[PDB]
C-alpha cells in the first residue's frame, strides 16, 4: 500500500506461485497479497500473467478482486 | 448545383505524404514474403521452361490424348494458355469462361460488358511470368484488363480500359518492350505504350483491306501484319513513319486467318489465308521460300513457336496437324474456330462449332 514494489516483482511473485502449490492453507492470504501487488504494478504485471494463470487453473483459484484487476489490465482501463 | 461532382484525385494524391517515405520499400526487401513467393514462382517458371525444353529435344510424338471434354454456355471465340499456371481462359461472345485442365472444373464466369453487336476477338496474358493480367480487346476498339480472374478469395477486377483505334481488332503484346499495337478495320497501326498510357507511334498501314492478323518479333522491330485482300506487309518502327514499310509481297487473295511469326532470329512468316495454302516468307526476301496447300476451305488455324506444328482446322471436323515442311503426323477425327498451343508444353486446344473444349497432350 505504501512502498514501491516494482523492482522486487520476481523476488516475491515466484515464492508466491510456489506457495500456492506447496500449501493450500496460505492460498487465501497469498492471493490477497497477489491482488494488492497487481494493483500496484498495473501494466508491469502483464509479463507474469501467463505463468500465474497456469498456476491458478491447476488448483482452480477464482479470486474476485484478482480476476477484475486482470480483466482491467488486459482491457487497458485505468482505475 | 448538386450535379457538380468532385473527384477524389486531389485528396488521393495527398495520401502520398501520409505514407512513409524514408524507409526501404517492400520490393527491395530480399527476405520479404512477396519476393520469396515471387522467387518461388520464378523457380517454378524456370523449371517449366526447362522441362518443356527437354520434351522438345525428345521430339514430338503423335498427339491424340483427350484430357477432358466439357461444354460451355457460349461459342468459344478465342482461347489462350497461361504460360505457367494451368488457367485456360475460354472466352465467349457475352462471357469469359475460365476453365482448368488438372482439376477439370469451372473456375469463373465474367461478363465482358460489351454490347450484343461487338465480339471479343483477341486476348492476351499480360505479365505472364508473375502477377498475370488478362487483356481483353473488343472488336469495336474497346480494350480492357482483368485481374484476379481465377482466384479463390477474390472477385473479378477490371484494372483499366480505354477505347482503342476509333477482322475486328488484333493485338500483339510485347512484355519486354512494354508496347501494345492495336489494329483492325482502320488503316493505321497504333502503338500504345502502357508505361506512358499514350499512343507513341501511329504507323500508316497503306492498305485498303482490314488488318486481319498482326504478329511481331521480340528484341527487334518486325511488325508483321496480314491483310484481308491477301497481302502481308512488314514494318520497321525504327525508321521514319513514311519509311516504316519495308516489304510488300502479295501471293494470296483471302482473309489471313493467322499470319504468325516465330521467336527465332531466323524469322519465318507462316501465313495461311482462307484458301488454306501455306506460304513461308522471310523478312529479308521478296518472295516465298516454301509453299504448301493443305485444306481447300480453311476456317481457323494455330501454330506453336517451340514446335513447328501448323494446327489446321476443317469444315468436316478434321484437325490436320502438319509440320512446316509439310509432313503428315495426325488427322484427328472428332467450324473449328479456335485452336491454341501452350507457349511451353506441346498441349493443343481445339474448339469446334459445338461449345466443347478439349486439351490434348503428348503422352
Amino acid at each position: 500500500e505504501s512502498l514501491d514494489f516494482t523492482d522486487y516483482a520476481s523476488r516475491i511473485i515466484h515464492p508466491i506461485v510456489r506457495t500456492l502449490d506447496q500449501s493450500p492453507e496460505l492460498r487465501s492470504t497469498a492471493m490477497d497479497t497477489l491482488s494488492s501487488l497487481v494493483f500496484q504494478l498495473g501494466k508491469k504485471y502483464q509479463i507474469f500473467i501467463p505463468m500465474v494463470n497456469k498456476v491458478l487453473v491447476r488448483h482452480r483459484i477464482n479470486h474476485q478482486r484478482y480476476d477484475v484487476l486482470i480483466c482491467r489490465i488486459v482491457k487497458g482501463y485505468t482505475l | 448545383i448538386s450535379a457538380t461532382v468532385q473527384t477524389g484525385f486531389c485528396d488521393w494524391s495527398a495520401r502520398y505524404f501520409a505514407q512513409p517515405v524514408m524507409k526501404i520499400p517492400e520490393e527491395h526487401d530480399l527476405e520479404s514474403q512477396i519476393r520469396k513467393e515471387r522467387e518461388w514462382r520464378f523457380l517454378r517458371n524456370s523449371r517449366v521452361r526447362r522441362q518443356a525444353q527437354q520434351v522438345i529435344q525428345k521430339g514430338i510424338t503423335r498427339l491424340d490424348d483427350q484430357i477432358f471434354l466439357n461444354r460451355n454456355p457460349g461459342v468459344p471465340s478465342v482461347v489462350k494458355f497461361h504460360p505457367f499456371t494451368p488457367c485456360i481462359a475460354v472466352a465467349d461472345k457475352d462471357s469469359i469462361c475460365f476453365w482448368d485442365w488438372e482439376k477439370g472444373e469451372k473456375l469463373d464466369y465474367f461478363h465482358n460488358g460489351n454490347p450484343r453487336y461487338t465480339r471479343v476477338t483477341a486476348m492476351e496474358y499480360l505479365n505472364g511470368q508473375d502477377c498475370s493480367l488478362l487483356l481483353t480487346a473488343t472488336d469495336d476498339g474497346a480494350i480492357r484488363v482483368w485481374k484476379n480472374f481465377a482466384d479463390l478469395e477474390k472477385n473479378p477486377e477490371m484494372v483499366t480500359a480505354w477505347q482503342g483505334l476509333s477482322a475486328g481488332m488484333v493485338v500483339d503484346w510485347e512484355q519486354e518492350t512494354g508496347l501494345l499495337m492495336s489494329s483492325g478495320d482502320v488503316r493505321i497501326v497504333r502503338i500504345w505504350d502502357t508505361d506512358r498510357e499514350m499512343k507513341v507511334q501511329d504507323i500508316p498501314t497503306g492498305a485498303d483491306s482490314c488488318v486481319t492478323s498482326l504478329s511481331c518479333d521480340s528484341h527487334r522491330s518486325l511488325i508483321v501484319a496480314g491483310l484481308g485482300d491477301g497481302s502481308i506487309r512488314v514494318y520497321d518502327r525504327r525508321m521514319a513513319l513514311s519509311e516504316c514499310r519495308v516489304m510488300t509481297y502479295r501471293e494470296h487473295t483471302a482473309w489471313v486467318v493467322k499470319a504468325s511469326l516465330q521467336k527465332r532470329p531466323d524469322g519465318h512468316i507462316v501465313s495461311v489465308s482462307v484458301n488454306g495454302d501455306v506460304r513461308i516468307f522471310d523478312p529479308r526476301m521478296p518472295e516465298s521460300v516454301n509453299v504448301l496447300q493443305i485444306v481447300k476451305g480453311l476456317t481457323a488455324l494455330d501454330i506453336h513457336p517451340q514446335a513447328d506444328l501448323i494446327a489446321c482446322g476443317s469444315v468436316n471436323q478434321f484437325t490436320a496437324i502438319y509440320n512446316s515442311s509439310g509432313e503428315l503426323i495426325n488427322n484427328i477425327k472428332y467450324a473449328i474456330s479456335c485452336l491454341a498451343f501452350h507457349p511451353h508444353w506441346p498441349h493443343l486446344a481445339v474448339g469446334s462449332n459445338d461449345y466443347y473444349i478439349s486439351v490434348y497432350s503428348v503422352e
Binding site: - | 461532382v5 484525385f9 505524404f17 512513409p20 524514408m22 505479365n127 502477377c131 512484355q175 519486354e176
Partner: protein
C-alpha cells in the same frame, strides 16, 4: 539461368494508381485543438502567519521550523517580517505569472477577506482567480468545515465557514491550502459543492483544489526544512529540490557538497546556459514527461495545457508529492492523480542534479567553465533508438515531451527537428500524438527563424502535419508562414524533393480557402510555380500544377494574373507529359481555370475556347484516370455556358 529475364521485365498496370483506388483518405476527428485558453487574472495571498505567536493546537518544538518564504520572521521583528514575507511571496509567484494583480492579506479579518475576494471576483468574473491560504499561525481546521482567522484586535481566532468562503469566490477558481489538517477543507469543500448541487435542482469541475496534507496527517516539524514546505515547493521548486537532495543518503556519492554551496550556486532561473537555469530547464522536461506518461490524455490537456500557471503548479506539485511522501505526508488534489512518486524518470532527475552540482567546487573556487549536462543529448539518443524499431504501434516513447523542450534552444535544435520528422514519417497515428502533446505552436514559431539549415527540416515536418490536419492552413496564413515556404519554392539550390513538399504545403494552404488564395496570389505564387513547371521531377510537376489550379479556384483575380502570365499556354506542354499523374493534374488546373469565368470580357471567352480545343484533344488517352478529370474539367465549361450547351443539345433532338 532463366531468372534474370524474369526480374528484368516491366510489370504493366501495376502501380499505385492501378492497385489502390483513387480515393481520399477519411480525415479523423482532430481533437488536439485546445477548447479555450484560461488566464489567471489575479491572485489572493491570504497569510495567517501570526508572526511572534504560536498556535495553541500544536505545541511547537524549541527549534521547530522557522523559515517562512525563505525569511526568518524572528530576525526582522514581528510587523516588518510579516510585510516582508508578503512581498517576497509576491515576487516568487511573479516568477511563474508576472502579469497578474496581486493583493496580499496579512492576518486578515472576515470582512477584509470578504471585500478582498468580492473585489477580485468583480475584476475577473469569467476568469480563474487563485486563493492561497497559509494557516501555519492559526489552529487546525475543524471537522465542521471551518477555517480560522483573527479579530480586529488579534485577541481571538475567528472561524470562517468554507461555504461562505466559496460563496464569495466564483466558479472558475483554484484553491491552495497549506495547513495541517488540509484534507478536512477539501472534503468539506466537496460537501458544500454537492450541497449546492442539491439546492440547485429545487461549481465543482471548475474548482481545482491542492492541499499540503491529508486530514489526519500533520505537517513536519523538522528544523532542517522550512516551515513553508508546501508553498516553497509550488513556488520555488529548484531551491528546495537541491536542499532536499543534500539531505538524502545519496550525498555520500558527492562528498564536499554542503548546503552552503547550494546557497552560492551561480546563475539565474532564466538563463538556460547557466548552471541554475540548466536544472530549471531539465526539471520542466522531467515533470512534463512524468505527467504525460502517467495521466490520461484528457486530464493532461486539462491541467498541463490549458493555462500556464496551473500547469506550472501541477508540475511543481509532482515534486511536492515526492518530497513530502518522505516525511509521512501525502499531498491532495481535487482531480485525483495516480501516484507518480515511484516513476522511473525521478531517478533521472537525481543523476542530472548530481552531475550538475558535482562541478560546483570547481565552478566557485577554481572558476571552471560550467560544462552543460548530457541529459538532453542522451534523451534524444534514446528517442533515436526507439525510432529504429518503432514501426509497430507499441507504447509511445516516454521522451516525446522532452523532444518538445529541446526545440526551444538552438544547441540541439537541428538534431531534434530531424528526429521529429523521422517520427512523423512512421505514420498518421504518430502525427496525431505529436499534435496532442502540443508541438504545433512551437513548430509554427520556428517559421520565424532565418537559419537556412532549418528550411529542409521544417518543410518536411509541415508536409506531414498538413497531410493529416488540413485545418492548420488557417494558422499558417495568420502568422505569415506562407512566406517562409515561398522562399523555399524559389530556391534553385534546394533539392527538388523538398521543393515538392513545399508545393504540397502551399497547395493545402490555398485549398478551398479564399483568405489563403488571396494571400498567396499577392505573394506571386503563379509566377513562381511556372518557373518550376518544367522541372526534371514528375512529383513536382504534378503538384505545382494542382497548386496552380487551386489558386484560381473561384478566384478571378488569380485567373487574371494567370492570363497575364499566360499560364494556360504553358500548361499545354504538360498535356503531353509521359507521367499520367502530371497529365491529370494538368487537366485539373486547366478545368479550374475555365470554371471561374464569372462573365468577364470577351477575351475570356476566346481563351476558354482555346483551352477547350486543347483539352478536346485529350480524348484518345490510355488512362481513364485522366479521362475522368477530363469530364470534371469539361463540367466547369458546361456550368459556365449552360445556356449555350442547351442550344446544342436541343438541336440534335
Amino acid at each position: 539461368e532463366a531468372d534474370l529475364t524474369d526480374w528484368n521485365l516491366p510489370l504493366a498496370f501495376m502501380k499505385k494508381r492501378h492497385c489502390e483506388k483513387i480515393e481520399g483518405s477519411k480525415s479523423l476527428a482532430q481533437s488536439w485543438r485546445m477548447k479555450d485558453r484560461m488566464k489567471t487574472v489575479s491572485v489572493a495571498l491570504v497569510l495567517c502567519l501570526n508572526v511572534g505567536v504560536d498556535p495553541p493546537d500544536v505545541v511547537k518544538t524549541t527549534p521547530c521550523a522557522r523559515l517562512e518564504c525563505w525569511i526568518d520572521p524572528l530576525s526582522m521583528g514581528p510587523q516588518k517580517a510579516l510585510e516582508t514575507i508578503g512581498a517576497n511571496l509576491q515576487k516568487q509567484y511573479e516568477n511563474w505569472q508576472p502579469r497578474a494583480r496581486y493583493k496580499q492579506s496579512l492576518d486578515p479579518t472576515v470582512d477584509e477577506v470578504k471585500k478582498l475576494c468580492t473585489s477580485l471576483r468583480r475584476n475577473a468574473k469569467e476568469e480563474r482567480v487563485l486563493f492561497h491560504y497559509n494557516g501555519h499561525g492559526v489552529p487546525r481546521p475543524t471537522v465542521n468545515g471551518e477555517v480560522w482567522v483573527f479579530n480586529k484586535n488579534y485577541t481571538q481566532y475567528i472561524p470562517l465557514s468554507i461555504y461562505d468562503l466559496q460563496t464569495w469566490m466564483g466558479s472558475p477558481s483554484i484553491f491552495v491550502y497549506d495547513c495541517s489538517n488540509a484534507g478536512l477543507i477539501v472534503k468539506s469543500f466537496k460537501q458544500f459543492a454537492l450541497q449546492r448541487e442539491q439546492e440547485l435542482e429545487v461549481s465543482m469541475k471548475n474548482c481545482i483544489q491542492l492541499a499540503a496534507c491529508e486530514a489526519t496527517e500533520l505537517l513536519p516539524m523538522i528544523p532542517d526544512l522550512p516551515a513553508d514546505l508546501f508553498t516553497s515547493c509550488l513556488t520555488t521548486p529548484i531551491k528546495i529540490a537541491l536542499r532536499w537532495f543534500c539531505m538524502q543518503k545519496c550525498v555520500s556519492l558527492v562528498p564536499g557538497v554542503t548546503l552552503d554551496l547550494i546557497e552560492k550556486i551561480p546563475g539565474r532561473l532564466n538563463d538556460r546556459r547557466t548552471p541554475l537555469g540548466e536544472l530549471n530547464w531539465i526539471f520542466t522536461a522531467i515533470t512534463d514527461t512524468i505527467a504525460w506518461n502517467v495521466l490520461p490524455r484528457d486530464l493532461f490537456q486539462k491541467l498541463f495545457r490549458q493555462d500556464l500557471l496551473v500547469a506550472s503548479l501541477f508540475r511543481n506539485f509532482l515534486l511536492a508529492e515526492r518530497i513530502m511522501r518522505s516525511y509521512n505526508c501525502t499531498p491532495v488534489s481535487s482531480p485525483r492523480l495516480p501516484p507518480t512518486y515511484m516513476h522511473a524518470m525521478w531517478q533521472a532527475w537525481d543523476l542530472a542534479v548530481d552531475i550538475c552540482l558535482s562541478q560546483l567546487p570547481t565552478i566557485i573556487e577554481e572558476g571552471t567553465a560550467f560544462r552543460h549536462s548530457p541529459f538532453f543529448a542522451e534523451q534524444l539518443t534514446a528517442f533515436q533508438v526507439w525510432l529504429t524499431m518503432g514501426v509497430e504501434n507499441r507504447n509511445p516513447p516516454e521522451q516525446l515531451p522532452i523532444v518538445l523542450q529541446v526545440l526551444l534552444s538552438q544547441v540541439h535544435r537541428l538534431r531534434a527537428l530531424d528526429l521529429l520528422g523521422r517520427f512523423l514519417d512512421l505514420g498518421p497515428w504518430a502525427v496525431s500524438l505529436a499534435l496532442s502533446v502540443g508541438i504545433f505552436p512551437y513548430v509554427l514559431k520556428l517559421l520565424q527563424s532565418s537559419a537556412r539549415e532549418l528550411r529542409p527540416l521544417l518543410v518536411f515536418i509541415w508536409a506531414k502535419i498538413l497531410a493529416v490536419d488540413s485545418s492548420c492552413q488557417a494558422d499558417l496564413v495568420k502568422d505569415n508562414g506562407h512566406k517562409y515556404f515561398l522562399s523555399v519554392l524559389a530556391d534553385p539550390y534546394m533539392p527538388a524533393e523538398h521543393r515538392t513538399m513545399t508545393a504540397f504545403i502551399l497547395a493545402v494552404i490555398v485549398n478551398s480557402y479564399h483568405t489563403g488564395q488571396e494571400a498567396c496570389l499577392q505573394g506571386n505564387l503563379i509566377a513562381i510555380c511556372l518557373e518550376q513547371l518544367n522541372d526534371p521531377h514528375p512529383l513536382l510537376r504534378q503538384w505545382v500544377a494542382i497548386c496552380l489550379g487551386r489558386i484560381w479556384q473561384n478566384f478571378d483575380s488569380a485567373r487574371w494574373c494567370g492570363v497575364r502570365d499566360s499560364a494556360h499556354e504553358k500548361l499545354y506542354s504538360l498535356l503531353s507529359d509521359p507521367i499520367p499523374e502530371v497529365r491529370c493534374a494538368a487537366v485539373f488546373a486547366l478545368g479550374t481555370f475555365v470554371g471561374n469565368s464569372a462573365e468577364r470580357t470577351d477575351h475570356s471567352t476566346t481563351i476558354d475556347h482555346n483551352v477547350a480545343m486543347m483539352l478536346a484533344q485529350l480524348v484518345s488517352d490510355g488512362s481513364p484516370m485522366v479521362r475522368k478529370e477530363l469530364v470534371v474539367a469539361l463540367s466547369h465549361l458546361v456550368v459556365q455556358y449552360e445556356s449555350n450547351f442547351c442550344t446544342v443539345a436541343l438541336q440534335f433532338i
